[PDB]
Amino acid sequence: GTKQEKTALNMARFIQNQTQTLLEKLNELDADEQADIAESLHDHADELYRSALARWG
Amino acid sequence: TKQEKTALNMARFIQNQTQTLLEKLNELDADEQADIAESLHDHADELYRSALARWG
């Protein structure tokens, strides 16, 4: 990857981790409405990170 | 509550990150990745919307 590609990979890694952290926070709030969306959010973040990692990592 | 506001703000920060990463991927040759990021961003917008309705 170029430097720009690596910056995008790093940001995808960050969102993967940050979405896991927000999911845990919502689960502690027993905020089911939000945690339901957050789980799907984190799944897409994981998918994107793995996709970027394969390509530029 | 402090805990609720922490989660709302984190949702907003994730929304900003997902918009930023979708734009970066669109700027790169990254169709496969940008397609995923479109859905990722729609989820971050919906989570922020929902959390704002509840805790804003």
PDB file of C-alpha atoms in Angstrom:
ATOM      1  CA  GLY A   1       0.000   0.000   0.000  1.00  0.00           C
ATOM      2  CA  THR A   2       0.897   3.692  -0.415  1.00  0.00           C
ATOM      3  CA  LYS A   3       1.126   5.927   2.653  1.00  0.00           C
ATOM      4  CA  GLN A   4      -2.484   7.034   1.957  1.00  0.00           C
ATOM      5  CA  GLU A   5      -3.641   3.370   1.774  1.00  0.00           C
ATOM      6  CA  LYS A   6      -1.910   2.688   5.104  1.00  0.00           C
ATOM      7  CA  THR A   7      -3.653   5.690   6.688  1.00  0.00           C
ATOM      8  CA  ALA A   8      -6.979   4.234   5.602  1.00  0.00           C
ATOM      9  CA  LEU A   9      -6.047   0.761   6.980  1.00  0.00           C
ATOM     10  CA  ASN A  10      -5.109   2.364  10.319  1.00  0.00           C
ATOM     11  CA  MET A  11      -8.431   4.222  10.413  1.00  0.00           C
ATOM     12  CA  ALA A  12     -10.325   1.000   9.659  1.00  0.00           C
ATOM     13  CA  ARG A  13      -8.460  -0.699  12.530  1.00  0.00           C
ATOM     14  CA  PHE A  14      -9.364   2.209  14.806  1.00  0.00           C
ATOM     15  CA  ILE A  15     -13.073   2.049  13.910  1.00  0.00           C
ATOM     16  CA  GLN A  16     -13.045  -1.755  14.457  1.00  0.00           C
ATOM     17  CA  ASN A  17     -11.724  -1.246  17.960  1.00  0.00           C
ATOM     18  CA  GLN A  18     -13.822   1.806  18.744  1.00  0.00           C
ATOM     19  CA  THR A  19     -17.082   0.133  17.634  1.00  0.00           C
ATOM     20  CA  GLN A  20     -16.319  -2.858  19.905  1.00  0.00           C
ATOM     21  CA  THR A  21     -15.803  -0.415  22.795  1.00  0.00           C
ATOM     22  CA  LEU A  22     -19.083   1.379  22.091  1.00  0.00           C
ATOM     23  CA  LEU A  23     -20.950  -1.945  21.818  1.00  0.00           C
ATOM     24  CA  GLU A  24     -19.617  -2.960  25.285  1.00  0.00           C
ATOM     25  CA  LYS A  25     -20.631   0.454  26.681  1.00  0.00           C
ATOM     26  CA  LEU A  26     -24.144   0.106  25.284  1.00  0.00           C
ATOM     27  CA  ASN A  27     -24.428  -3.446  26.633  1.00  0.00           C
ATOM     28  CA  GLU A  28     -23.525  -2.060  30.095  1.00  0.00           C
ATOM     29  CA  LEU A  29     -26.314   0.558  29.600  1.00  0.00           C
ATOM     30  CA  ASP A  30     -28.705  -2.319  28.633  1.00  0.00           C
ATOM     31  CA  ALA A  31     -29.559  -0.042  25.804  1.00  0.00           C
ATOM     32  CA  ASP A  32     -30.909  -2.849  23.584  1.00  0.00           C
ATOM     33  CA  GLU A  33     -32.212  -0.529  20.837  1.00  0.00           C
ATOM     34  CA  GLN A  34     -28.785   1.020  20.405  1.00  0.00           C
ATOM     35  CA  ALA A  35     -26.745  -2.177  21.055  1.00  0.00           C
ATOM     36  CA  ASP A  36     -28.659  -3.944  18.287  1.00  0.00           C
ATOM     37  CA  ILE A  37     -27.454  -1.331  15.718  1.00  0.00           C
ATOM     38  CA  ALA A  38     -24.032  -1.168  17.343  1.00  0.00           C
ATOM     39  CA  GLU A  39     -23.513  -4.929  16.925  1.00  0.00           C
ATOM     40  CA  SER A  40     -24.265  -4.638  13.189  1.00  0.00           C
ATOM     41  CA  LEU A  41     -22.066  -1.503  13.006  1.00  0.00           C
ATOM     42  CA  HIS A  42     -19.136  -3.346  14.523  1.00  0.00           C
ATOM     43  CA  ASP A  43     -19.645  -6.322  12.194  1.00  0.00           C
ATOM     44  CA  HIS A  44     -19.355  -3.981   9.172  1.00  0.00           C
ATOM     45  CA  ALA A  45     -16.288  -2.330  10.754  1.00  0.00           C
ATOM     46  CA  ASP A  46     -14.677  -5.756  11.251  1.00  0.00           C
ATOM     47  CA  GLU A  47     -15.507  -6.713   7.646  1.00  0.00           C
ATOM     48  CA  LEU A  48     -13.979  -3.496   6.338  1.00  0.00           C
ATOM     49  CA  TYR A  49     -10.852  -3.809   8.465  1.00  0.00           C
ATOM     50  CA  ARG A  50     -10.220  -7.395   7.397  1.00  0.00           C
ATOM     51  CA  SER A  51     -10.808  -6.419   3.747  1.00  0.00           C
ATOM     52  CA  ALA A  52      -8.378  -3.479   4.025  1.00  0.00           C
ATOM     53  CA  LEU A  53      -5.843  -5.632   5.954  1.00  0.00           C
ATOM     54  CA  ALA A  54      -5.822  -8.282   3.224  1.00  0.00           C
ATOM     55  CA  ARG A  55      -5.344  -5.628   0.557  1.00  0.00           C
ATOM     56  CA  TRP A  56      -2.788  -3.188   2.032  1.00  0.00           C
ATOM     57  CA  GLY A  57      -1.569  -4.869   5.211  1.00  0.00           C
TER      58      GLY A  57
ATOM     59  CA  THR B   1     -26.531  10.305  32.900  1.00  0.00           C
ATOM     60  CA  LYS B   2     -22.760  10.596  32.473  1.00  0.00           C
ATOM     61  CA  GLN B   3     -22.653   7.023  31.052  1.00  0.00           C
ATOM     62  CA  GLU B   4     -25.415   7.836  28.549  1.00  0.00           C
ATOM     63  CA  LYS B   5     -23.715  11.010  27.337  1.00  0.00           C
ATOM     64  CA  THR B   6     -20.392   9.153  27.007  1.00  0.00           C
ATOM     65  CA  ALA B   7     -22.095   6.643  24.665  1.00  0.00           C
ATOM     66  CA  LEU B   8     -23.902   9.390  22.642  1.00  0.00           C
ATOM     67  CA  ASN B   9     -20.615  11.287  22.142  1.00  0.00           C
ATOM     68  CA  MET B  10     -18.805   8.111  21.173  1.00  0.00           C
ATOM     69  CA  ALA B  11     -21.527   7.426  18.602  1.00  0.00           C
ATOM     70  CA  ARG B  12     -20.987  10.863  17.168  1.00  0.00           C
ATOM     71  CA  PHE B  13     -17.220  10.374  17.015  1.00  0.00           C
ATOM     72  CA  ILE B  14     -17.708   7.009  15.207  1.00  0.00           C
ATOM     73  CA  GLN B  15     -20.067   8.750  12.732  1.00  0.00           C
ATOM     74  CA  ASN B  16     -17.294  11.280  11.955  1.00  0.00           C
ATOM     75  CA  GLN B  17     -14.688   8.499  11.542  1.00  0.00           C
ATOM     76  CA  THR B  18     -16.883   6.437   9.240  1.00  0.00           C
ATOM     77  CA  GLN B  19     -17.653   9.493   7.048  1.00  0.00           C
ATOM     78  CA  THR B  20     -13.956  10.300   6.936  1.00  0.00           C
ATOM     79  CA  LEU B  21     -12.915   6.727   6.019  1.00  0.00           C
ATOM     80  CA  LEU B  22     -15.646   6.428   3.353  1.00  0.00           C
ATOM     81  CA  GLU B  23     -14.282   9.624   1.749  1.00  0.00           C
ATOM     82  CA  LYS B  24     -10.691   8.372   1.889  1.00  0.00           C
ATOM     83  CA  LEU B  25     -11.653   5.076   0.256  1.00  0.00           C
ATOM     84  CA  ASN B  26     -13.572   6.874  -2.487  1.00  0.00           C
ATOM     85  CA  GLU B  27     -10.416   8.916  -3.169  1.00  0.00           C
ATOM     86  CA  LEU B  28      -8.344   5.693  -3.427  1.00  0.00           C
ATOM     87  CA  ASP B  29      -8.808   2.824  -5.932  1.00  0.00           C
ATOM     88  CA  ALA B  30     -10.839   0.898  -3.417  1.00  0.00           C
ATOM     89  CA  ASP B  31     -14.284  -0.015  -4.802  1.00  0.00           C
ATOM     90  CA  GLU B  32     -14.585  -3.209  -2.721  1.00  0.00           C
ATOM     91  CA  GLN B  33     -13.652  -1.404   0.484  1.00  0.00           C
ATOM     92  CA  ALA B  34     -15.795   1.698  -0.233  1.00  0.00           C
ATOM     93  CA  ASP B  35     -18.852  -0.514  -0.781  1.00  0.00           C
ATOM     94  CA  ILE B  36     -18.421  -1.936   2.723  1.00  0.00           C
ATOM     95  CA  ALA B  37     -17.769   1.540   4.116  1.00  0.00           C
ATOM     96  CA  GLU B  38     -21.079   2.830   2.627  1.00  0.00           C
ATOM     97  CA  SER B  39     -22.982   0.317   4.751  1.00  0.00           C
ATOM     98  CA  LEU B  40     -20.713   0.986   7.718  1.00  0.00           C
ATOM     99  CA  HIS B  41     -21.495   4.688   7.522  1.00  0.00           C
ATOM    100  CA  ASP B  42     -25.277   4.109   7.151  1.00  0.00           C
ATOM    101  CA  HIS B  43     -25.070   2.068  10.458  1.00  0.00           C
ATOM    102  CA  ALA B  44     -23.049   4.794  12.213  1.00  0.00           C
ATOM    103  CA  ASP B  45     -25.603   7.475  11.091  1.00  0.00           C
ATOM    104  CA  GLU B  46     -28.478   5.317  12.371  1.00  0.00           C
ATOM    105  CA  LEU B  47     -26.785   4.586  15.710  1.00  0.00           C
ATOM    106  CA  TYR B  48     -26.125   8.280  16.276  1.00  0.00           C
ATOM    107  CA  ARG B  49     -29.712   9.162  15.239  1.00  0.00           C
ATOM    108  CA  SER B  50     -31.118   6.595  17.630  1.00  0.00           C
ATOM    109  CA  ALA B  51     -28.845   7.583  20.511  1.00  0.00           C
ATOM    110  CA  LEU B  52     -29.590  11.303  19.941  1.00  0.00           C
ATOM    111  CA  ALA B  53     -33.381  10.656  20.054  1.00  0.00           C
ATOM    112  CA  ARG B  54     -32.923   8.788  23.347  1.00  0.00           C
ATOM    113  CA  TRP B  55     -30.214  10.841  25.113  1.00  0.00           C
ATOM    114  CA  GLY B  56     -29.784  14.196  23.213  1.00  0.00           C
TER     115      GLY B  56
END
